[model samples]
Target: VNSFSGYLKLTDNVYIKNADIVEEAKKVKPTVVVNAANVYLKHGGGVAGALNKATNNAMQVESDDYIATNGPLKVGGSCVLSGHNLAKHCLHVVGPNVNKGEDIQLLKSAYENFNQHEVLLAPLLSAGIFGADPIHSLRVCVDTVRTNVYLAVFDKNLYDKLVSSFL
Candidate 1:
């Protein structure tokens, strides 16, 4: 059967950054796209919010359904949305709230939850409004998932720093 580590060999993943996340999203053409999110998608701030907005709030509506029916989408948990814009499927990973404790494992399982050739994403988290450490988050993600990934930069305003993680 097909599996995540089936893509065990490393890839020359490019950072098509210093550009728009949506712009890069168009190019990646991922069958599955990921969002480091909250159990309730409370992070209407970072990549999750943008993805929710980008999906024309379909993401929010569905995620809300999950929240209303279920309890907390624990760390390492994921939710999938189909017909999501840009990609065939979108994954929402419950990462630790900056106010809570930082759990790199939350980001970890999200990557493997789906299969191959997918772009498992983690934004420059520490730079967000709540502010987590991008370097630390980057280190953990890089160390955790050997498969391909995209460290997407959401802000169209920032020019060069968007390329930071790639460097």
Candidate 2:
């Protein structure tokens, strides 16, 4: 299931499915997707890193002076003009760097810090870059989080199992 497969219907339009974040990004062309950013806009690991690596201009806004918190950057459209670009807008937020309170209040802070679409595209917020467990992280994310469109990335193996067992 490359781009057509869908699962974990969080809402009429929201969902959790297996696919590369960039791949989904290409399809949905989200204006602003969540970025699990840290102190330096490094986007060091996981989805953020993947996105950062794919989009050279993703970190272009990090140079502005501000506290480590929510940040928005252009991700798509005749910008960057070259090199792996897949975002039109990126909202980077600081993550705990490790699972403490975890995502119990992560997304809330992100949303509170900015305005997001009723349907937004995001991966497991801090689960990857911050060393949070997927089950616990997504459990909190899925229940405590609210968005019209959430494209969560799952391990291929796990997603494979879930997909194969689909009833």
Candidate 3:
């Protein structure tokens, strides 16, 4: 697999050099795209709530306008969790390593979007070279974005799988 990397330089505006994956993503087309990065607030901010706020601020969309969750939001958590505030359907899957007898539920949620015919877009799993492991990350991404074609911006190694899948 090919590998890619770069640093973001901010000079008046931020720019990334040597970022082929980003250039490739610019070529893909989609409708009403939502770019949800792994954003977390440092003070008094929960994951879901932060996502909702960011989505609303950037797109002028409301909380009930979309579904929101992260890899960390799992089962046994509060159903009335803060992030579910704006989601019509708030689903928290069981962590991959957790044997809480809820694996089926997790699978169902991960692949839920496949049943629909809409195009989906997401970043590559395990693209975080400094963070999570590739296998676990890819498993979550594939399970969630499998059915619909996803537009992803990732490192070269991660993008290979997406390209091979015709995504």
Candidate 4:
């Protein structure tokens, strides 16, 4: 498992750390938990899956119900879902899938979409499996969210790469 000795301060109260995103989300109980989501809001794999599993599938059941009513979430768009066993809410943002021709612009929008929440525990959006560079995703996540942010990075190598950018 990836581990960081201490959290790195990005700004006054913003930080980045290596952690199990879902476990940290449960610990902090932030205003909302940010999930790197698909346009369809399917909480099946990656960080989304971990979160859903942690919540005992409550998040997924809610997401399925939400999608049944609202159709698919659009790229750069987000929907707030009831946080089953963690935060008061979960913010699901559809980030760019570089393989699908999505670019940094949409990724920025997705990160920026978190502006409504003051405190949040977020994963590196689109940095996993979606084919985005983790460094790019981390930078945008730090730059876009203006309030308290905890970046839960799960990969040791990726965390080191991100730390180098700061140094």
Q: Pick the candidate with the highest lDDT.
A: 4
Could you tell me the lDDT of residue 58 within candidate 3? 30
Native-to-model Cα distance after best TM-score fit, residue 30 in candidate 4, in Å: 1.9
RMSD of each: 5.8, 6.8, 11.8, 3.6
Task: Indicate the residue-level lDDT of 4 in model 2.
Answer: 33
Where does candidate 2 stray beyond 4 Å? 1-7, 11-13, 57-84, 99-115, 160-167
Q: Residues 64-106, candidate 4, lDDT per residue (tens digit)? A: 8889998999899999988778788989988998878887688
lDDT of 3: 0.31
| lDDT by residue (tens digit), candidate 3, 1-167 | 11112433212211222233223233333221222222121112222233345434432132223224332333312122222223222222222222223343343343343334243333332134213344444455544543443333445555454334431
Give the per-residue lDDT of model 2 (tens digit) for 1-167. Answer: 22434557754444778878777776766655666665455555677667766666435444333323444332110111111355466656554556544444454454332234454566665566477555554554545445455655747875555445433
Poorest lDDT segment (10 consecutive residues) of candidate 3 = 37-46
lDDT of 1 at 127: 43
Estimate every model's Cα lDDT from 0 to 1: 0.56, 0.53, 0.31, 0.81
Q: How many backbone clashes does candidate 4 have?
A: 0
Give the Cα-based TM-score of candidate 2 against the true structure. Answer: 0.65
Pairs that collide, model 4: none
Q: After superposition, how far is residue 58 of candidate 4 from its true place, in Å?
A: 1.3
Candidate 4 accuracy as TM-score = 0.90
TM-score of 1: 0.69
